């Protein structure tokens, strides 16, 4: 129950720094075993309900897609006849790690599991943190660098979710313990309709809450808010939250009722959390209201900035709706109902830029092939995580072009010179087998035809072939984004091919004993949990 | 140091309310508490 010193340092992402905790190796093995055991036993004993994210069943883009579908599948979610409103609020539970009381944590951990495990975990969070000549005992808050800290924080966050929702609404959302609901589904429409809180999720420390308000309850909420905190000078609009990257017509003015409902929703959610445990600050929030005035639903999940436009608003062609657009369907009428417009948030454009800056500052004393390798990893990670939204976002393409230019400039400065004629595209983008740098490209790089000729020596002459003479058109460096299947199509094919797999399993077990590897060759590289 | 001096910021009634909320939720879902990893428990080696 008494443990060693834990080293602490900072990792620099150039915009934020985070503490990294270095633990003694033998205790690392004990904590890794405890972590695996606790996650396994929590899964089989059904500790975590559906809203506790990240679950082991979605990639984060599939989480954003499922959230959009769960928004779209609700009852009358896009109707505004009786003046009703929709409020989606995204916020970040502030100082949850700093403000963990270890005695209360020990008690709650004793609630879910054996007291020896709880005692070990609480004694593990009380260690001495040392950095160089500085050292102090951590007796308040949790250590995020222990192996089992993910499980402990997901349990503590589940308790905070209970405090935000209330036990009745949490039981209604999570469903009965015998047959729990899936993600963003209810048992029937009566259970869904009864409470204003329609959807809820928590990604570690960020909660997304989706509320549906009829006219009278919204009126009562706004009346209570201005009764508690009056502001008669129309100063409530000064400082509200809205996204600027959406166009000059796609974003509309924010009226009295919308801003007042957003502030009332935030104040009501802040009134539920004890400040001695956690809070939601107004600067970390983003609230968007769907009303009769603005027909837009704004949120931003896992780095995708999503704007939802129901199709019962473009009846007179209000908006273009021609992009890399997720097309949302209704599960009742089985037809298209809303469109989701994707952008990459400017924070993640900054994260990619900071990753490239990290590459260029960790690698001045490195080889050119190392620069190309690190660049390839960064570009592939970006384009295979964002896909559609990377193509739609203009700022991301500008940043990608500038960062690729910086990588090539680092190679050039390495040689001695930055001379463009000295460096054809064949130097950089040749595959590494032929001695090239093997860079992958996400920029529009045209290849002049002077790099399409070759000499050959024969016994009766020497032939200087110039290919592409019949064209006056340059061949273009292949964009990486044309080799990555978009997310929406990948999800659709995943659903389709998994229903097919269940079909062949049903008519395979009433026949053979094992499914072969010939009937699933057509279904080989399909499915988000790939088959 | 400020937490040692200025006491637990989570007051006693707040901690009691949070504890009872967790208790009522956990009995409502009929949660079986996690045992200590037993001596035999085959899955141990795979988990290891």
């Amino acid at each position: 129950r008494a443990f060693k010193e834990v080293g602490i340092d900072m990792n620099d992402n150039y915009s934020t720094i985070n503490p990294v905790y270095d633990v003694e190796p033998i205790e690392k093995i004990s904590d890794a075993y405890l972590d695996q055991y606790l996650w396994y036993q929590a899964d089989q004993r059904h500790l975590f309900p559906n809203w506790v994210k990240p679950s082991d069943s979605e990639v984060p883009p599939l989480l954003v897609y499922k959230w959009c579908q769960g928004i779209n599948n609700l009852d009358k979610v896009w109707d505004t006849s009786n003046g009703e409103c929709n409020v989606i609020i995204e916020t970040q539970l502030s100082k949850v790690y700093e403000k963990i009381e270890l005695t209360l944590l020990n008690s709650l951990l004793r609630l879910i599991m054996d007291h020896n495990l709880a005692d070990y975990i609480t004694a593990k969070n009380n260690v001495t943190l040392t950095y160089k000549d500085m050292s102090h005992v951590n007796s308040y808050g949790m250590i995020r660098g222990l192996q089992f800290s993910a499980f402990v924080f997901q349990y503590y966050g589940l308790i905070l979710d209970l405090l935000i929702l209330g036990p009745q609404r949490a039981a209604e959302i999570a469903g009965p313990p015998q047959s729990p609901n899936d993600f963003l589904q209810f048992q029937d429409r009566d259970t869904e309709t009864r409470h204003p809180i329609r959807l809820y999720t928590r990604y570690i420390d960020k909660i997304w809450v989706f509320l549906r308000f009829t006219a009278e309850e919204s009126r009562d909420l706004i009346q209570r808010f201005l009764t508690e905190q009056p502001d008669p000078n129309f100063e409530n609009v000064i400082g509200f939250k809205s996204k600027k990257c959406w166009p000059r017509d796609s974003r509309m003015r924010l009226m009295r009722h919308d801003v007042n409902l957003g502030r009332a929703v935030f104040w009501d959610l802040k009134n539920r959390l004890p400040r001695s445990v956690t809070t939601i600050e107004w600067d970390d929030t983003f609230v968007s209201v769907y009303s009769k005035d603005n027909p837009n639903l704004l949120f931003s999940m896992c780095g995708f900035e999503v704007r939802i436009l129901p199709k019962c608003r473009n009846q007179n062609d209000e908006f273009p709706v021609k992009d890399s657009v997720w097309s949302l369907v209704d599960n009742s009428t089985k037809e298209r109902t809303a469109h989701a417009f994707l952008q990459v948030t400017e924070e993640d454009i900054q994260k990619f830029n900071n990753r490239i800056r990290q590459i260029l500052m960790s690698s001045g004393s490195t080889t050119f092939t190392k620069i190309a390798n690190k660049w390839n990893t960064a570009l592939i990670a970006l384009f295979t995580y964002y896909r559609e939204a990377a193509v739609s976002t203009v700022n991301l393409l500008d940043t990608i072009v500038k960062c690729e230019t910086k990588i090539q400039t680092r190679v050039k400065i390495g040689l001695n010179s930055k001379m463009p004629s000295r460096f054809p595209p064949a130097v950089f983008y040749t595959p590494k087998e032929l001695g090239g740098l093997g860079m992958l490209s996400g920029s529009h790089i045209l290849i002049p035809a002077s790099d399409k000729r070759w000499c050959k020596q024969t016994d009766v002459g020497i032939t200087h072939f110039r290919a592409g003479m019949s064209h006056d058109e340059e061949t273009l460096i292949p964009n990486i984004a044309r080799y990555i299947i978009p997310w929406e199509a990948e999800f659709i094919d995943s659903q389709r091919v998994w229903t097919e797999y269940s079909q062949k399993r049903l008519e395979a077990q009433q026949q053979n004993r094992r499914l072969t590897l010939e009937d699933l060759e057509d279904s080989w590289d399909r499915g988000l949990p790939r088959i | 140091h400020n937490h040692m001096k200025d006491g637990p910021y989570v007051s006693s009634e707040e901690a009691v309310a949070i504890y009872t909320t967790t208790v009522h939720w956990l009995e409502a879902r009929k949660f079986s508490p996690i045992p200590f990893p037993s001596v035999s428990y085959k899955h141990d080696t795979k988990i290891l």
Partner: peptide
């Protein structure tokens, strides 16, 4: 063996329930 088959079937059911999540129930 039967034990390895049971754990593999548990894995396959886990992957199915991760793939079927959101549409049948």
């Amino acid at each position: 063996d039967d034990s390895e088959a049971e754990e593999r079937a548990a894995y396959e059911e886990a992957q199915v329930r991760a793939a079927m999540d959101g549409l049948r129930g």
